[PDB]
Amino acid sequence: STPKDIWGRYMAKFDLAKSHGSGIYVDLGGTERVGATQHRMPTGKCPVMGKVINLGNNADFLNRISAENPQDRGLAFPDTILSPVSAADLVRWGYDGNDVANCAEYAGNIIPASDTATKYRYPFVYDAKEEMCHILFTPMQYNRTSSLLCMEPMKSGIDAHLYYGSSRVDKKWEENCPMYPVKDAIFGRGANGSCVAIESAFEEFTRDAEECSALMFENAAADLESAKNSKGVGMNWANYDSNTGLCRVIEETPNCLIIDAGSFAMTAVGSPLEQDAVPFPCDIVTNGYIEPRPRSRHIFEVTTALSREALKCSKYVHEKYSESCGTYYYCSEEKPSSW
Ligand SMILES: [Ca+2]
């Protein structure tokens, strides 16, 4: 069938407006009355790996907001115990999903004292390394050593094992959300029976996938500077070429992939680490253009494919190794050195 068609099942997760549906960088996509007041809160459906909040006082954001020393205060629930709780605790208490899902459901069952009927819920951060579930005392994420109240989100490689989310996290987050870089992949959209690489919103050389991930994250869907809501729209995806270090951040929704060894197709919600990648899906076969075609006022367009029959080529066919699928084919102007 068409590229859009044969990719449709695999690529649904990458449509972050649908699978997540709220801001990623800053998620304040919901509002709820608590008494007389409206308050904004996160409502995104995917957990966001590696999202930490950097604080003005330089305290780790998972410290209690009620630490004795003001220099120590984070964003975590005070001890006056709701929080943090262990993954095992949550299973003790009857929760039946994975740990990240349990943590989200647990955040969903903690109701603000000031009003016992509010639909208002706090965010969580699940630490997969310590297996501990933290409830945050505030949905604040971005605000201009200062105070704790001076803050911004960042995507952190070494905290890749942290998951920031809202109580609306999909129980099936792991299958429905793009949580992993796709190895040997470039994001594209279907055009004229091929998968064509999506043009960069902007590009920069970065030192590793994590840096590329952090660059894109800063520009991802953000529910502030009601009408301040992103609906999940933003520069949410990036192609990291591990051979060149070129990070291409994109803002169009991908709906297919092009195979290309050494390239990593990353998203603002998913792991920042190459280590966490998932192999290219060898079973889904289409012809791809590796290079974009942006608007330009000024040669040969390399195509790739997992099979010789699928590859559209008007010159020489070569073979290249990929970790994901072993050998695949590309169309080049050079004659094979086998010849
Ligand atoms: Ca149960």
Automatic annotation (TrEMBL):
GO MF entries: metal ion binding
Cystine crosslinks: 46-177, 103-133, 195-256, 212-247, 282-325, 313-331
Heme keyword on record: no
GO cellular component annotations of the record: membrane
Keywords linked to the UniProt accession: Calcium, Glycoprotein, Membrane, Metal-binding, Signal, Transmembrane, Transmembrane helix
Major location (coarse): membrane
Mode of membrane association: Single-pass type I membrane protein
Binding site for Ca(2+): 94, 96
Region forming the signal peptide: none
Compartments in which it is found: Membrane
Family from the record: Belongs to the apicomplexan parasites AMA1 family.
Name recorded for this polypeptide: Apical membrane antigen 1
Species classification: Eukaryota, Sar, Alveolata, Apicomplexa, Aconoidasida
Parent sequence residues shown: 93 to 510 of 606
